């Protein structure tokens, strides 16, 4: 995977770091879209 943020990463809140992850090709089997967009090629999701 790769570290990748969400739509509401946390501009003024705790734990705002890359706790989300990009899965290229498409997402991981237990995660979901944390944003409307995804990536260049890939897709960002959270858990």
Alpha-carbon span 23 to 28, nearest angstrom: 7
16: CATH: 2.20.20.10
Domain span holding position 6: 1-47
Q: What is the token pair recorded at 34?
A: 């944390």
Q: What is the token pair recorded at 1?
A: 């995977």
Left if phi > 0, otherwise alpha if psi is -120 to 50, otherwise beta: which for 36?
Answer: alpha
15-38 core/surface letters (b: 16 or more CB in 10 A; e: else): eeeeebbbbeeebeeeeeebbeeb
Helix then strand count (H, E) for the chain reads 0, 3
Number of domains in the chain: 1
């Amino acid at each position: 995977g790769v570290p990748c943020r969400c739509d509401s990463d946390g501009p003024s809140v705790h734990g705002n770091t890359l706790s989300g992850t990009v899965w290229v090709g498409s997402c991981a089997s237990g995660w979901h879209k944390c944003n409307d967009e995804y990536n260049i090629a890939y897709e960002c999701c959270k858990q």
